[PDB]
């Protein structure tokens, strides 16, 4: 058989634009430095350029492809090159990470679009307050290459989170968890990704 993620890699490599901008990010994201696995800034940059410059039909195919097995979900999880772009020795606190994000024009803007566009509403048919999967996917993919870079965490599901947790939150733990769970347990986002994977 193969899988939908392979098919999306095939389509990308057969398209002049997708192919070029994929290589443009795979390069800095896998080129190790002295005493570091990659240059995270240059990898982040190329990731942003990938999603900004490559039409959604190609760039989303690889990020949001639907899977039936672990060979597929593991390919999908590697799309953003997480060893370089996502993981770090330690997880910062999500409220500190949000603060860092907000000092940066692109991060602040993409983060706000995310909370605005992927707001779940349980009373809606789409399950999204703004009722627009396209704007939620745009907002989510938009975070990739910011300090708020998110990725799939749970290989049996579509669950995502940035690289942060809520350890040592003091009085702000409830706010922290609200922020973190907006990524982890987000019916609007999950439906939007499922919708893209179906072929809407």
């Amino acid at each position: 058989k193969g899988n939908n993620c392979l098919d999306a890699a095939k389509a990308c490599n057969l398209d002049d634009t997708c192919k070029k901008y994929r290589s443009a990010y795979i390069t800095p994201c896998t080129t190790s430095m002295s005493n570091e696995v990659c240059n995270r800034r240059k990898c982040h940059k190329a990731l942003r350029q990938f999603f900004d410059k490559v039409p959604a039909k190609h760039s989303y195919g690889m990020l949001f492809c639907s899977c039936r097995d672990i060979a597929c979900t593991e390919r999908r999880r590697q799309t953003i090159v997480p060893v370089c772009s996502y993981e770090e020795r330690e997880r910062p606190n999500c409220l500190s990470l949000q603060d860092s994000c907000k000092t940066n024009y692109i991060c602040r803007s993409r983060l706000a679009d995310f909370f605005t566009n992927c707001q779940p509403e349980s009373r809606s048919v789409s399950n999204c307050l703004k009722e627009n999967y396209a704007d939620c996917l745009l907002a989510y993919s938009g975070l990739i290459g910011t300090v708020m870079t998110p990725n799939y965490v749970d290989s049996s599901s579509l669950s995502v989170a940035p690289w942060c947790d809520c350890s040592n939150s003091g009085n702000d733990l409830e706010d922290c968890l609200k922020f973190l769970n907006f990524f982890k347990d987000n019916t609007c986002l999950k439906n939007a990704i499922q919708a893209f994977g179906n072929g809407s």
Partner: protein, 101 residues
Amino acid sequence: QRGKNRGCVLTAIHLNVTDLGLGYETKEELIFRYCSGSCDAAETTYDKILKNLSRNRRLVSDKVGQACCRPIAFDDDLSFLDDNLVYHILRKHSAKRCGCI
């Protein structure tokens, strides 16, 4: 004048990366493009000399040291994820433009 060596052209083929025999183990794919066709017409001083020396028999032979149809520019880099989830990048593997050189 209307273009010497018009027959030197680009041809595209659809391949698995594994077909290239470059040592990779992956299910990923590419378009590979190559340059072929004749370069009989002389486009340089050096090539004119070779052709003229065969014509006047100072070179006891024909088509010796001739130019050939070769890439003069390459397609963009191609990357892929292999079976062990390792990324690779292919460079200067596919032709973008052909010429006699």
